[PDB]
Amino acid sequence: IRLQEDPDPEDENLYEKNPDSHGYDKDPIVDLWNMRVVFFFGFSIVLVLGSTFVAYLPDYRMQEWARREAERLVKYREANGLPLMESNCFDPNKIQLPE
Amino acid sequence: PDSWDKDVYPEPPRRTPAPAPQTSLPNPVTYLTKIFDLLVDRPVTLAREFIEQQHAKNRYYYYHREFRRVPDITECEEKDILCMFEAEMQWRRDYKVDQEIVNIIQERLKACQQREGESYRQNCAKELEQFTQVSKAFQDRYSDLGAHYSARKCLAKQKQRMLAERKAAKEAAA
Amino acid sequence: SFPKYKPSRLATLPATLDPAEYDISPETRKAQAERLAIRSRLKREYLLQYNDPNRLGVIEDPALIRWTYARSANIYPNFRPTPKTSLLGALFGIGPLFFWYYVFKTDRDKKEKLIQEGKLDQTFNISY
Amino acid sequence: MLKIIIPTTMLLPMTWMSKHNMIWINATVHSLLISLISLSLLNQLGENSLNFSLTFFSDSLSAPLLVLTTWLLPLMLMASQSHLSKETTTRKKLYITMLILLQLFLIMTFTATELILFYILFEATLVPTLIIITRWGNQTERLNAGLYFLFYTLAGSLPLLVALVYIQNTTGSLNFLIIHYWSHPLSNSWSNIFMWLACIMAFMVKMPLYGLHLWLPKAHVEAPIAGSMVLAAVLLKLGGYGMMRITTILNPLTNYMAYPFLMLSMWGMIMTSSICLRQTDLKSLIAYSSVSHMALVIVAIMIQTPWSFMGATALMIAHGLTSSMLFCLANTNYERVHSRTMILARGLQTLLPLMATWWLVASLTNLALPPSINLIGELFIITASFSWSNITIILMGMNMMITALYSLYMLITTQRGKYTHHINNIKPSFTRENALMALHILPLLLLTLNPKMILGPLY
Amino acid sequence: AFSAPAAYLTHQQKVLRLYKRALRHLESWCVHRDKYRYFACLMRARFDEHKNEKDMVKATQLLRQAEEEFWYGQHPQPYIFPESPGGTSYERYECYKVPEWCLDDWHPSEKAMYPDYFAKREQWKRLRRESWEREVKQLQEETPPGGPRTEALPPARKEGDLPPLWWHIVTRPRERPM
Amino acid sequence: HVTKDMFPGPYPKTPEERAAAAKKYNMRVEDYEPYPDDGMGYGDYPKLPDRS
Amino acid sequence: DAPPLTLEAIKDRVLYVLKLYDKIDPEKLSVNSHFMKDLGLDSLDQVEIIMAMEDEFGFEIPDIDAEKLMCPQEIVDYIADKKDVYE
Amino acid sequence: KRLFIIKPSGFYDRRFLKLMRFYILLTGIPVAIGITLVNVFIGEAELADIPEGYVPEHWEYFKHPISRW
Ligand SMILES: CCCCCCCCCCCCCCCCCC(=O)OC[C@H](COP(=O)([O-])OCC[N+](C)(C)C)OC(=O)CCCCCCCCCCCCCCCCC
Ligand SMILES: CCCCCCCCCCCCCCCCC[C@@H](O)O[C@H](CO[C@H](O)CCCCCCCCCCCCCCC)COP(=O)(O)OCC[N+](C)(C)C
Ligand SMILES: CCCCCCCC/C=C\CCCCCCCC(=O)O[C@H](COC(=O)CCCCCCC/C=C/CCCCCCCC)COP(=O)(O)OCCN
Ligand SMILES: *P(=O)(O)OCC(C)(C)[C@H](O)C(=O)NCCC(=O)NCCSC(=O)CCCCCCCCCCCCC
Incomplete structure (x- = not known):
């Protein structure tokens, strides 16, 4: 021997002292309420409410706005015979090349 | 329902x-x-x-x-x-908006191919040319600008393309 | 009379065709008895622990512990940079990197040269 | 962002003033509430980010990471409940305080608007992780793991600090918006090469990159369950976020300096998958799988195309969730048998059916089963790499095959077969463990249903 | 599987195992019963012809040549009984075998669903717990000072005792547990 | 319950070291054979036959 | 599906096979008839008897256990123990 | 004769499954009922041109009633 050391204790089983244990705490009431709050808050509140909130988040990415603008521009372009997509993004009149 | 524009979404x-x-x-x-x-x-x-x-x-x-x-x-x-x-x-x-225009043209092409069916190679050739033109213009504009694309980078690309076109035209008619 | 079976690394020789299985010396019997004694001692220890009613847990296996320790935590202290180890490490750690660098550099140079010459089919390529 | 920052700094006094038997309940409930509050950041714009103030801003890249961190905190709390039953009240409160401080630092790091504040917080995350590892690890190698982790990170990141102060002196500001609008091309000279090396190498050591990755197995194997969960899921994504942020000012030099890192990352995917094929430790297998996935993310960021950033973000989120779930399952198996050897315990499908189901689902998500966001990100990265060059497809294909091989190998080894005869302490799975696995897995499927929220700002 | 192996196989054991293997492979080759009977009679005629041999060296040489002949002439796909190792039904029911230590982790409601079974289970557990000291004492009394030399366990000498190390052999799962 | 002397160590050079290693791995001294000392990190771990 | 085996059925079937053996006199055959001590057989005959039992019952007896079954009662006990027959 | 079938304790797994189902359906059913009622009795907004000299709000620029809220 080299030290006055405690022996390694045997691991305790929560099911021995409480067959209805949820694995949260060794106190039955505290374990039950920990399980209840975890399940309620996490599953119900977070999952369901956050999922429906994200599903019905407003269209701030302007996907539908972009689609409507594209439809309007396509209609105007093909009604007047103009090309659907312009050749250049900017105006060559405003662009001054170095020469 | 038919709550969409027939001219924007043509159908024979x-x-x-x-x-x-x-x-x-x-x-x-x-x-x-x-x-x-x-x-x-x-x-x-x-x-x-x-x-x-x-x-x-x-x-x-x-x-x-x-x-x-x-x-x-x-x-x-x-x-x-x-x-x-x-x-x-x-x-x-x-x-x-340009991305959505390209999407509209692609939807036209897909619908025309499915509608024509067995004779698509000839019947839906008008959508193919429009898609070719739109795709070429879109590629020339928003070509490989990278993940950090910007209006300045697009302007630089356009200036480079304009310089190349001017040089080609000069060396052709000079 | 019959064609002979030629053992290989993945086609090892069967125990009935081993020449040493038919030339047995009295020392070989002693070795076999010693092996059986060792196996019996280990089996007895394991069976005592396994049939102990008060045991609740995992019977620790020193052989398994030694195997896991030797394969993971015992490699570096017993490593000496011999020429064999140096060459094998350099090869298997550097050669693939330069091989792939050369391959990808050649491919990308060819593609870039084609793009510059304007003879590469880039039509309908609007997603990169 | 103060509406999210302040509740964590209120979690601290609540934890320290709560009763001895209510600390876990209070921490879990209020962490879940904070996660619900942080869910509002997903309402991003399409053109510019959300600029709350001069100090904090949120983007389509920052929001999913913040949500992931705020969601990951209560799961770490549950795991800590699992493995810290016999600890004293003060030490349990200190552990919860370390977790809370780490979450707060991560939130501020993700929402920082300047590179120097980002660096300060991103280095501040080292202290709680090191304390957690070296204090609540179970084996002797925890001290060595902490030393390796700390010194790898610091050796990577100090030249980043030098480069950042140099950049501020040269240009005028380190504000991300300014350095994006006022960005100028980087010439091909030795000084620019070394500045690029400083920044990129810092974030690659953090990532990690193949050859600079031994700290990852060392720290993840020896860390406690909460430490492993936070190390794999969020702390590995600091390098990816930094690279996606810092590469704005490194062009066009990135087109020339990316070759060594791309080759390293691809061959590292191959090598780490092959290592996973022959691992005798389950945690080491999970750590090397994490290394392979992060190497794929590195490839995406380095090729730097609009289709590669979306895949990078999706893969980061998916890998974080999957690795956290895998570590939780491995920790449950370890706590049952007190050993990390994989072949020690078998027949766990016969002994524990529901855990076998969780293992099956986690291993299916790991090998990128469609239409999971893991596969979405991997497929986007593969397509971008194919556009980059046409042999990356070969490398990605062999990597994917080996990934499926080792995932199903670990599944079959742990769950299928004949149970070990002498292991008679396999108690039924706890409701806490089952709920932990369910809370890990359900958001993955919900994000599969709605994938546009984790595809970054280039969507 | 129920018998402790010896240190080595004697010549008689080697030749008997070779005879059984040769008969099984001959049956695999000779599908039909009459043909199999004819050729099995021929094989046993060969074995009986070589049965009487005083020279052990010559007997060993004959055995070696016979083993070479068997390996050359063996059936590539020999018949295997379905439950035998390598058979199509081998280890099929290993996933349905659950032990009594798993059985004692049940909930009180589940145990109350089967009241009469668990009374007998408790009787068996008491019987096991009341014999372990006698079993270990008997084992340690009969071992040589060096240790066990074989994997054979002694029986119960006394009337009130049980054969040592009996629990798992007796309570092993049934061959068709479900 | 495993002590520090039960773990694998360096390559056994003297015959006494080989005997101690063989005793450690529960093997006969004659049957014990380590990998060749090529610096590959095997140590004193026995080289068992390559069978499955 | 298949009807379960019983000790009486196993004994009847093994005695049926032994009585169908041509080297055993059915009149002097019983469940305690030693194959070599009082039936006058040898090792090859015992091996053939074991193989016949294997064919009869559709399962294989390992050679380590087959070399020790020298009685019809021993064969019955082995088959019953392997098949988990208790009645 | 009927023989006892030795199985691991499935009571805890069944209890967890029933608890998860109950707590998901505790608020999921009200959410689904509310969504159905809103979609039935309060339909989506109809696209219309902006009246002259009128400045709407962002929720007036959005369509679905829940998104507008
Ligand atoms: C989760 C915590 C929330 C905390 C904050 C809660 C604030 C609640 C404030 C009161 C509710 C006001 C709703 C809008 C009233 C109608 C007028 C209007 O502006 O309409 C705008 C727009 C368009 O209105 P409009 O101006 O175009 O005209 C419509 C016609 N009239 C004039 C008759 C109203 O939307 C609607 O009118 C439809 C409203 C649908 C509301 C139900 C769907 C959402 C359900 C949410 C459930 C969550 C809990 C909610 C609890 C409270 C419920 C009341
Ligand atoms: C049963 C077997 C299941 C397993 C096998 C799967 C087989 C297929 C099962 C399919 C079931 C669902 C089919 C019906 C889906 C209905 C709901 C769906 O349509 O809505 C989705 C929406 O789902 C939600 O968006 C998913 C929410 C995902 C985020 C949840 C986060 C919860 C907090 C957890 C944090 C985790 C952090 C992780 C990083 C963020 C898609 O969006 P969208 O159709 O257009 O919305 C319509 C509303 N509009 C019209 C106004 C737009
Ligand atoms: C012409 C067709 C070639 C086809 C190639 C087929 C594969 C063969 C090439 C790889 C096989 C292994 C060779 C390298 C491994 C070293 C061999 C070795 O270990 O030898 C050492 C001693 O070291 C040597 O003998 C060296 C001889 C070979 C040297 C080869 C030249 C050195 C190359 C220098 C470059 C190293 C870096 C390469 C990668 C750089 C980046 C590309 C001792 O050998 P033992 O195993 O103990 O004895 C076994 C006897 N049969
Ligand atoms: P029982 O206890 O009565 O004793 C019989 C034995 C044989 C044990 C004798 O006591 C004995 O040992 N006698 C002397 C040793 C001896 O007989 N040696 C030679 C016997 S082996 C032999 O002769 C076999 C040769 C013929 C069979 C060869 C098999 C090859 C055919 C393979 C075919 C596979 C596919 C068809």
């Missing part, structure tokens, strides 16, 4: 041949269509009528947001952060 007129049977046997397809109309179509039509009656009780409207035009990066001075920001936002909105 539908020619359905008239039924001209040459046999005395009954038509199981016709009998099953009658059964389907009696059992499904009428109940769903009644349900939709009730729902649309409920919708018309309180009718409210939503609008399409209109964005004003602002000076672009060509008119923006160097190191002018406010004008650069406005031009960048305008350019990004234009980029998204």
